[PDB]
Amino acid sequence: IRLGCNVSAPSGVLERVKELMEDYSRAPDAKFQQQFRHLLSVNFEEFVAETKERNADLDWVNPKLDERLQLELGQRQLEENAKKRLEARKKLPTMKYADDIIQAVRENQVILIVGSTGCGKTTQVPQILLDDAISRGCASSCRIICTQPRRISAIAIAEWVSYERCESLGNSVGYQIRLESRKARERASITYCTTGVLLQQLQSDPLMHNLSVLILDEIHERSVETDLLMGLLKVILPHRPDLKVILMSATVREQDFCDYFNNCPMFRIEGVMFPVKMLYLEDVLSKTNYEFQKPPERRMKHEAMIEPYLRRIRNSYDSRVLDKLRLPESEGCEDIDFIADLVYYICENEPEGAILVFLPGYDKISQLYNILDKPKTSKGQRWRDHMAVFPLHSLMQSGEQQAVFRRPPAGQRKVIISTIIAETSVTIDDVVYVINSGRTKATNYDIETNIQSLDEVWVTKANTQQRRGRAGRVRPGICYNLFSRAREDRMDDIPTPEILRSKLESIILSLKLLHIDDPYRFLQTLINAPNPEAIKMGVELLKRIEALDQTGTLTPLGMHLAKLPIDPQMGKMILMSALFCCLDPITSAAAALSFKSPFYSPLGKESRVDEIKRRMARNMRSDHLMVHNTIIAYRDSRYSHAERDFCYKNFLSSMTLQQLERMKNQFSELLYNYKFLASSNCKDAASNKNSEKIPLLRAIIGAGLYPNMAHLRKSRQIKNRVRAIHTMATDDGRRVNFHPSSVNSGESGFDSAYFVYFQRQKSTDLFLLDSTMVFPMALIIFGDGVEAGVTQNTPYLCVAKTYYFKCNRETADVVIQLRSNLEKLLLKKALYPAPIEENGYEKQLIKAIELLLSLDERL
DNA sequence: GGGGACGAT
Prior knowledge:
Strand content: 5-15%
Keywords: ATP-binding, Helicase, Hydrolase, Nucleotide-binding, RNA-binding
Number of strands: 26
InterPro entries: DEAD-box_helicase_OB_fold, DEAD/DEAH_box_helicase_dom, DNA/RNA_helicase_DEAH_CS, HA2_WH, Helicase-assoc_dom, Helicase_ATP-bd, Helicase_C-like, P-loop_NTPase
Organism: Drosophila melanogaster (Fruit fly)
Domain Helicase ATP-binding: 102-270
Helix content: 40-55%
Domain Helicase C-terminal: 338-515
């Protein structure tokens, strides 16, 4: 057991800390307390009874409006722009089943609609179910909710379904997203929303009494929210006989949802797309005639799969080609000069259209971009100036432009080098050729060793099936699969359903507001039950941050954390920021970890965006504090009317920056309504009196990211110029390093040796994707595992019983006493939410902490 | 010295 630096405090400081704590100790309307004990007092049976009478607006309908809408419905049926927008509607496959669906919804609680892309189930089925109730004279009783996996989906489908009715947005069709809503009318309505929005509207309406039909769509992607909702529907529907809900899916393992609902009726409806011809590796090399020129069991493990297949079709391709499939180099994207030649192939033959190339990640997207842009080969020189190459990646701006979606200049063909982002999220219309390497990346979490890893793996058959349809949106296309058909048969059906890949601490908490107290029993109900060990780890963390007691029941703090749209750890961090008057920078850090970072990473300027993140970090050695600095600079550029030049100079997305600002202001209102803030402005002066005390911020950042700590021990000089080598290990002993995109990557001369992080990930090394340098005094205050004693013959104070620091008994005795009242303050404030009076008893304890943390300020 | 798309009244 080794000892760290000294964390003792001067006499005059402790004398004042003891003064403030003694001052805080002699102190003597909670509607929330009545709320918190009432949820625990009820069991499920009275829980269901109380919410039915609380949410009963749909028990009333208005006939004066029923008949009014019924008479106006087809007054439009007689005009010739309606009655001209409906024959085009009845050229969509779903309208042919319209009457059968009206029947199937009437006699079944749940139905399933399975349909390929282009059928228009999303666009039509809500209209069909709405127009039926209207013409029957039941319009005011019909309220339709239709979930979508992504935001961009929920809007564009709401905009076009609206124009199909000759109405502007918000009359009969509306959308409701996080931070954004153009909501439709109250009744006789269609509302497209994100799955997440419905899940939070559940805590006030847990058994869906404010809707008449629910439409879950793209459940085939098996996102966490869709499988959660279907598990939650099995609890709700026994108590809601009149609730209709129909599931929507593509043609990937559709029977799973039919089985999950006891063989509910399933509608398989037509597809409307152009035929896409599908080649494979044996078919591509048969036309291209490329060959590869420039490990101990791979050669025979591919031998074990392919030549059982090579000798199958022995007389179906030339044997010069079948030797080309014994190579482990032939399938995937190992030889990118092969994909390069395949692109040059498509340019000569195979007439007009765009090429979309699916490569696993940023690394191999760059290699062909450079091969295509500055080619070393003769035939590459010929095609260079007649290709318009757009690389597509979530960390690149091309996806937020108009160019990649527009058709290329005359005499040039557009080539898109993308990740899987172009599979469902981003869609390009003029694509007619797809080169699917079959290789992508994914994160797997090892539950046994607690390491997240990003690994290059093979694509599913579901992803390959989805990428085929990308080329068939405008004309007959071709999809080039760079892997043998034998490889396809070892490929899994669908990607690992992500409920088996997530940390569940947020979902365990969310379920407590819905009176689902046993997460082992409930999560076993889902289509694919999560590992019970991953459930225990969620419970154990929630117990550590004390959102639950040791019995498992949820605490008054846990209820607030369950009510904030953010993971419970930083939800607690946002909460601490209100107590400590640094709302603006901490909410920027929490909003930036919950969603994306604003910085683009355009190809070739890797070095330039390293220098610019360091400039906006302002030497504060924090990837989280630097994003707030970026928001401060982004705000100032709007006051300066220099927004565009600022975002260009500095490689930021104006789109995500504004989304970060909207979520921060969302955190402000929610705490203000929870009686934690006197004002709903994240920039208000009272909530920000400490917003530039930098040791104050790392303490609150550490309070949220604890216990993800790491200690640095070494630093290099010889013999470069800037970047240093770090021997640094997390608290578990595992040696790690700053991720190169992190601000602290390769830096030297840190004021402190200890760091906190949000995410550690293994790709090339154990990397910390983000880090803020913290001080031992801050960790000891807010962390746990704090004991005082002697070891060599040396007085110490430890944190997590991992990091032991020298300090005398005089300071250790009071910070232990300071931790005890900080804990009894937080519990009272969660039970009786009120903002801290600036000249009150509680502020004295706050100032006692500001004083101890101020001792680590820059000299 | 390197970043597989989603998302929360």
